[PDB]
Write a protein that binds this DNA or RNA. Sequence first.
DNA 1: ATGTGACTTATAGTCCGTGTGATTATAGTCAACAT
DNA 2: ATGTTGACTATAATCACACGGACTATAAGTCACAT
Lengths: 76, 77, 77, 76
Amino acid sequence: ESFLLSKVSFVIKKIRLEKGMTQEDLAYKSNLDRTYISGIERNSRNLTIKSLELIMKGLEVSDVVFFEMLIKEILK
Amino acid sequence: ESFLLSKVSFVIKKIRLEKGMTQEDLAYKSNLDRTYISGIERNSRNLTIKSLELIMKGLEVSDVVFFEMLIKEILKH
Amino acid sequence: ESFLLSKVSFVIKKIRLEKGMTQEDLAYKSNLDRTYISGIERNSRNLTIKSLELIMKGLEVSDVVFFEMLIKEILKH
Amino acid sequence: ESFLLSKVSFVIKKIRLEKGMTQEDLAYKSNLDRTYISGIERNSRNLTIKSLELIMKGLEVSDVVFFEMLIKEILK
DNA sequence: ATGTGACTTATAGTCCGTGTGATTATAGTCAACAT
DNA sequence: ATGTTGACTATAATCACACGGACTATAAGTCACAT
């Protein structure tokens, strides 16, 4: 697997939780598949930017906040 | 098309020129086709995080540094 | 345009495919531009004996056997 | 300089002589410059196929006969 | 609720080639004077 | 006759790039069945 990919996924999971969402609800909100999301969170998926963008919409988080977070997460 | 993509697209080119690289050099070190590097910069193609990671390694730049410039380009007017 | 040129350009391609090479290998091995190899085959282009020699070295072929295949191509109907 | 380019030039000179032609006449017959011809024969020019072709027409020699000769000259 | 697996279908990514403006090196062509 | 030296100017040859079609790998999106 990839280092970045795991932290993207970790971040996605982090934010979903800090907000109190279920996967079911992140899937609904972003108009994507729930198993799709589960896959990403166990990090069994290699998103495209577009997909990442949809997940950010679903999380209701701007690109900037996401990347600010991803950076922090990246530095152990 | 996509907001984030053209930003990612823009930043890949910006860095590449800042480092005096050519598409040929880049696609070189990213072990992607020079067609793909062109494709990305040209028509903001929808790359995968893994591919983006390869390009970062190609640009001889870190995850962090890239995303910090990404944030800057998004914030601009 | 020129009789001999399209014969030369035909034979460069023939050999290139016979040896299972691609254009951009040959462009490397011949120590000429990517687009020049294309341009020679694609249209014809008016190359120099020195450049022709480089290509022959690149096709991994001798002056002699090149010209022998050149003669054969000229002689065709 | 180049081996091939030398043998080419030598051949051009050879054929010119076996036909009893002067350079002046070889240049008239192919409409090129006499100093141009001179230059090739003293191996100071790297001609293009197009030019080579004009010289063959000026020598009144077919492409095939030229290369047949060029091959033989190439083999010592 | 979340996590599998496995199975299509869209598309990301590859591979080989075409065609092009802009710049640099050099062949094409023609002087003057040689011998 | 041929040789040589500068020249000017056409174009060979370079360099960075765009663009397309066809093919291969894989992400996108949806089932069934776990827990």
